[PDB]
Structure 1
Amino acid sequence: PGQGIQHKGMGMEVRARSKAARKVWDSADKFTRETLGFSVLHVVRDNPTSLIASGVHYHHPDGVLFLTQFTQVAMATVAAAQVAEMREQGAFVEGAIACGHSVGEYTALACVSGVYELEALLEVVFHRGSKMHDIVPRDELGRSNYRLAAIRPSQIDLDDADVKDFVAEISERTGEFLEIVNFNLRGSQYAIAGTVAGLEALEEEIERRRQITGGKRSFILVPGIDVPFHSSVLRVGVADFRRSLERVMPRDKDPELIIGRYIPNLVPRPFTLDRDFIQEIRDLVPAEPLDEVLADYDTWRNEKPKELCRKVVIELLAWQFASPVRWIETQDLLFIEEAAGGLGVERFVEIGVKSAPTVAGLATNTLKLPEYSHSTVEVLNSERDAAVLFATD
């Protein structure tokens, strides 16, 4: 799962019991204390207000745990520790296909494929948080001319193509900026960022289009997000983060654990290293390291493949900043791959403790509407369903 459901003392019960959880937390907490002069344990355990770090000063009236430079770190460590325990009990299956939503994708790769050290994971994730704060213009009050909004196309007869249409029209019409940021659920969840007036005009449209609306149905504005990220406005700051990734993500890694198991955001379809796949990336995200590899695929000599996967993996993570996260396609893709590979019993488990109910509830409603085919499916959450995860009952 992604950010925003994080709670004070999340997964702190597991830390007191599991040994694997302690090693994940302590190795992470020690590094952060020595390098950046602060502890993630304290932040998670009791939520502070202001914090001063090495070069930076973070102040929030509510909590620092809800600040992204921290929140992402907390969320990543919580999940990484929970999977480690699941791995210690051997409950992790050898053929498990894994994916993540936004910041959760970094944890996904960390847990299943071990693509970075525990301290290495919290470096990228922390810096990615600090990178998300300085990207967009602000006022004296820290105001934004933009915002984000959550759409539900349902309750009326409207489709994904109908939503895309209406948004594209009002985007061109007013001359303002309106972008569909997140494709989450087929007929259920969509996120949209751009000019506030554009968000308002879009809110207005469905209220007019839907015949039954007296209450401004189907539209939820997002508090706290001032950045129209995952739109066409963010593509500038990738190159610096793309280098930062290559520093913290070296070339000795497991290709197979990622391939076919991992579903990027920028790329809705499963990771595989092929001339076909690398091209799909370039099309969505034009890039210098990628376009050359596509130009000559005749580099076939066996020294390449791991080195190829290592850059492709980083390209997906670096430009994940820019490209919209497709959760719809991620879910639907799983159906596509199963159907071609057989439909027999599947178990869907979400990890990260209290973040687990979200994308499961996202899956649950998705398992209903397109998936009506009557399939045996199990939706399991680390927070809620733990008795089922460890099979103890």
Structure 2
Amino acid sequence: GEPLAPSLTNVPDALVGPCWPAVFAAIGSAVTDTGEPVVEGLLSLVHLDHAARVVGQLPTVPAQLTVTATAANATDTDMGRVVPVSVVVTGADGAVIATLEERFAILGRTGSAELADPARAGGAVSANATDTPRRRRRDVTITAPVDMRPFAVVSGDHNPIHTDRAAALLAGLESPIVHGMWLSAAAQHAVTATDGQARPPARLVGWTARFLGMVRPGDEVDFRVERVGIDQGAEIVDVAARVGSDLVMSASARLAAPKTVYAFPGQGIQHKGMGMEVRARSKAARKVWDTADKFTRDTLGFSVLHVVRDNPTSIIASGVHYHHPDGVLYLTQFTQVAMATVAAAQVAEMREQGAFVEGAIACGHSVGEYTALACVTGIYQLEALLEMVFHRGSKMHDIVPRDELGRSNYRLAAIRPSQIDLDDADVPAFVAGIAESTGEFLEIVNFNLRGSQYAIAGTVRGLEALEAEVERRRELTGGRRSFILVPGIDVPFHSRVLRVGVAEFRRSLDRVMPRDADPDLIIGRYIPNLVPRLFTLDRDFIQEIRDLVPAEPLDEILADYDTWLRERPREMARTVFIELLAWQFASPVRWIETQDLLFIEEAAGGLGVERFVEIGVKSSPTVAGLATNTLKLPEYAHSTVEVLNAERDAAVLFATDTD
């Protein structure tokens, strides 16, 4: 009908076209135990079932591929003479493109033998799957064509029973019947149909279909596709075609897991009881909780489990006491470690349940980057990330001269360029001009949302100037509340006054970071905040991270890297990794450019993702909401990107939902 559209990727029932002559030759040369199923009942031959298994390769440029057909020794079951034939398709390089297994049933002659069932979904299930409750996905009503000669010529099998009338009478049928593989491809298109709504596209890996009844041309067949199970993030789905009130074909599909985004929020979501329900639910969450609290009590000097479970006034570490009136959690390093451990717990619970995509790229906010690296990629373990996070938080507070009463001369606020006629082409110029007018230090820090979320950090007088300008332009244009001061925090992160402790943070990281590292575990799967591009082993990346922000241990790689790549690839990869992570501290985030790269399709450049699920608490989904407004804005309003909260949308994300 009208709402659906064929998928952008080729459906797996396209390689079956050129291989029909090979399968017919195999049928002609097929033999039973001292007998041949080519003589007696070729006219009574019918397609019993079809199984499709594909490999990650799929031709896109016109190639010259080869197919081989092997016909197994046909048996004689209780319904007909079953002859199975296996066909594999290979490219010019010899790599296997797809594997097809289809059995043909000569309906006439039968025997006494067991009819083994075909492999479910082409045998693409990896023996690790859970039978989730069935969810309605789609229903379609496709009418079989009155004439099937077009399908005969496009596909390749000109079997006269489907087209001719005399041969249909000879075969014992009143009228010609439609190709079963027409139903196969129609169901495949119905299961891979795109409606434009929030749902990742379907790319079938394995797909099997069994043909039960017979359909005459012009019959109105209606499909029904139901979600069944999950296999390492990828979901198992099945389709039951029906013509009227009897099952005609029952097909099951194992489609590829979409490339998702695991975003990690920054400061401001912390509250008493973060992920305690997840702690009580899962067993892996309890394991990571115990490991984290044991590590904190053995190395740091406090219990993170108590800090998150309860909010005391002041706690005492190994060295001195830490105090915060409205809650000890709100202070920096305790909040950071709580974020890290909660994100790790949720990631472990997700990947223990099988709802975690292995190849998903990792991104996040300024401090959610380390959590992404540890959880999604696993470049380092929990203990190393916790100790480095606590060390950087402790080092952050003693690099800015503050008052003896705790006050300082740095405050930040969120400016909203709504109805004030500001954009990325003017906002930096606006900040620079107002900073020159005020005479104080002003910087841009967080590029959160394109329209109505920007963060400005600077001095108190400069912030007052910002507030006065914002109010005057607001009353000029109408009430918008475009200036909201940040609650509590007064440290100008991601600024030029944070270039003092960068070297000490670097040496602490080098002490913490392992001597050996795996660049492959992080290449193409990590988006740094300072440079919103994918982590790549390129001279362009190192040149950008050098000229954008100075680095004294990087000029050596710039001077010569070819022979040095041939000498120490891993060492230089670790060096650039730690350098980027270290100067992240004083560099502003580029969430806008990372979201733009993450939401634009592969065509025209940019990572075209299908799911954007951020792993953060449901009390205040900042990243999820900002992504929702970013998608909602007039540009790419047609983008079908699914946004989910790992806690608010747990039912959909774990596929334990019903209707």
Gaps of 5+ in 1: none
Q: Using the alignment, how far apart are the partners of 2:633 and 2:282 within structure 1? A: 38
Larger displacement relative to structure 2 (324-333 or 17-26): 17-26
- Are 2:458 and 2:492, in contact at CA under 8 Å, matched by a contact in 1? yes
What is the CA distance between 1:214 and its match in structure 2? 6.5
1:140-187 Cα distance to aligned partner (Å, 9 max, x none): 221111101101112332222222222110111221111111111112
Higher relative contact order (CA 8 A, sep 6+): 1
SS in 2 for 1:318: helix
Q: Using the alignment, how far apart are the partners of 1:296 and 1:80 within structure 2? A: 39
What is the CA distance between 1:28 and its match in structure 2? 1.1
Q: Using the alignment, how far apart are the partners of 1:270 and 1:186 within structure 2? A: 21
Call closer, same or farther: CA 1:277–1:343 in 2, change over 3 Å: closer
1:59-98 Cα distance to aligned partner (Å, 9 max, x none): 1111111111100000000001111121122322232111
- Are 1:356 and 1:383, in contact at CA under 8 Å, matched by a contact in 2? no
| Structure 2 equivalent of residue 120 of structure 1 | 384
Call closer, same or farther: CA 1:341–1:326 in 2, change over 3 Å: closer
What is the CA distance between 1:390 and its match in structure 2? 0.5
Larger displacement relative to structure 2 (355-364 or 272-281): 355-364
What is the CA distance between 1:41 and its match in structure 2? 0.2
Larger displacement relative to structure 2 (143-152 or 85-94): 85-94
What is the CA distance between 1:345 and its match in structure 2? 6.3
SS in 2 for 1:77: helix
1:13-32 Cα distance to aligned partner (Å, 9 max, x none): 11122122122111111011
Call closer, same or farther: CA 1:344–1:125 in 2, change over 3 Å: closer
What is the CA distance between 1:308 and its match in structure 2? 2.1
1:30-74 Cα distance to aligned partner (Å, 9 max, x none): 011122331100010011110111113211111111111100000
What is the CA distance between 1:279 and its match in structure 2? 0.7
- Are 2:444 and 2:457, in contact at CA under 8 Å, matched by a contact in 1? yes
- Are 2:322 and 2:328, in contact at CA under 8 Å, matched by a contact in 1? yes
Larger displacement relative to structure 2 (135-144 or 75-84): 135-144
SS in 1 for 2:643: strand
Q: Using the alignment, how far apart are the partners of 2:551 and 2:562 within structure 1? A: 19
- Are 2:438 and 2:461, in contact at CA under 8 Å, matched by a contact in 1? no
Call closer, same or farther: CA 1:58–1:140 in 2, change over 3 Å: same
What is the CA distance between 1:103 and its match in structure 2? 1.2
- Are 1:20 and 1:88, in contact at CA under 8 Å, matched by a contact in 2? yes
Call closer, same or farther: CA 1:213–1:301 in 2, change over 3 Å: closer
Q: Using the alignment, how far apart are the partners of 1:207 and 1:281 within structure 2? A: 38
| Structure 2 equivalent of residue 308 of structure 1 | 572
| CA RMSD after TM alignment | 2.0
- Are 2:416 and 2:453, in contact at CA under 8 Å, matched by a contact in 1? yes
How many correspondences in the alignment? 393
- Are 2:530 and 2:589, in contact at CA under 8 Å, matched by a contact in 1? yes
- Are 1:180 and 1:191, in contact at CA under 8 Å, matched by a contact in 2? yes
Larger displacement relative to structure 2 (285-294 or 358-367): 285-294
The structure carrying a bigger helix percent of its residues is 1
What is the CA distance between 1:253 and its match in structure 2? 3.4
What is the CA distance between 1:303 and its match in structure 2? 4.9
Larger displacement relative to structure 2 (271-280 or 153-162): 153-162
- Are 1:115 and 1:253, in contact at CA under 8 Å, matched by a contact in 2? yes
1:246-274 Cα distance to aligned partner (Å, 9 max, x none): 22221433323322221111112111111
Call closer, same or farther: CA 1:221–1:338 in 2, change over 3 Å: farther
Q: Name which one, 1 or 2, has greater alpha-carbon Rg.
A: 2
- Are 2:532 and 2:590, in contact at CA under 8 Å, matched by a contact in 1? yes
Larger displacement relative to structure 2 (212-221 or 69-78): 212-221
1:42 aligns with 2:311: no
- Are 1:154 and 1:188, in contact at CA under 8 Å, matched by a contact in 2? yes
1:372 aligns with 2:372: no
Percent of pairs identical after alignment? 91
- Are 1:231 and 1:323, in contact at CA under 8 Å, matched by a contact in 2? yes
| Structure 1 equivalent of residue 337 of structure 2 | 73
SS in 2 for 1:229: coil
Q: Using the alignment, how far apart are the partners of 2:609 and 2:300 within structure 1? A: 46
Call closer, same or farther: CA 1:223–1:23 in 2, change over 3 Å: same
Q: Using the alignment, how far apart are the partners of 1:331 and 1:92 within structure 2? A: 21
- Are 1:207 and 1:216, in contact at CA under 8 Å, matched by a contact in 2? no
What is the CA distance between 1:356 and its match in structure 2? 7.0
1:248 aligns with 2:512: yes
- Are 1:7 and 1:354, in contact at CA under 8 Å, matched by a contact in 2? no
- Are 1:150 and 1:192, in contact at CA under 8 Å, matched by a contact in 2? yes
1:217-268 Cα distance to aligned partner (Å, 9 max, x none): 2111112121122111111110010011122221433323322221111112
What is the CA distance between 1:341 and its match in structure 2? 6.2
The structure carrying a bigger strand percent of its residues is 2
What is the CA distance between 1:342 and its match in structure 2? 8.2
- Are 1:116 and 1:248, in contact at CA under 8 Å, matched by a contact in 2? no
Larger displacement relative to structure 2 (262-271 or 209-218): 209-218
Q: Using the alignment, how far apart are the partners of 1:107 and 1:47 within structure 2? A: 23
- Are 1:72 and 1:125, in contact at CA under 8 Å, matched by a contact in 2? yes
SS in 2 for 1:109: helix
1:336-364 Cα distance to aligned partner (Å, 9 max, x none): 46344688761101113347711111111
Q: Using the alignment, how far apart are the partners of 1:62 and 1:230 within structure 2? A: 26
Larger displacement relative to structure 2 (378-387 or 16-25): 16-25
- Are 1:40 and 1:70, in contact at CA under 8 Å, matched by a contact in 2? yes
| Structure 2 equivalent of residue 56 of structure 1 | 320
Call closer, same or farther: CA 1:108–1:144 in 2, change over 3 Å: same
Larger displacement relative to structure 2 (26-35 or 244-253): 244-253
Q: Using the alignment, how far apart are the partners of 2:619 and 2:507 within structure 1? A: 30
What is the CA distance between 1:299 and its match in structure 2? 2.5
- Are 1:91 and 1:390, in contact at CA under 8 Å, matched by a contact in 2? yes
Question: TM-score when scaled to structure 2?
Answer: 0.57
- Are 1:147 and 1:226, in contact at CA under 8 Å, matched by a contact in 2? yes
Q: Using the alignment, how far apart are the partners of 2:501 and 2:574 within structure 1? A: 21
Larger displacement relative to structure 2 (157-166 or 195-204): 157-166
What is the CA distance between 1:212 and its match in structure 2? 4.3
Gaps of 5+ in 2: 1-264
Q: Using the alignment, how far apart are the partners of 2:378 and 2:329 within structure 1? A: 25
Q: Using the alignment, how far apart are the partners of 2:513 and 2:634 within structure 1? A: 38
Question: TM-score when scaled to structure 1?
Answer: 0.94
SS in 1 for 2:440: coil
1:294 aligns with 2:558: yes
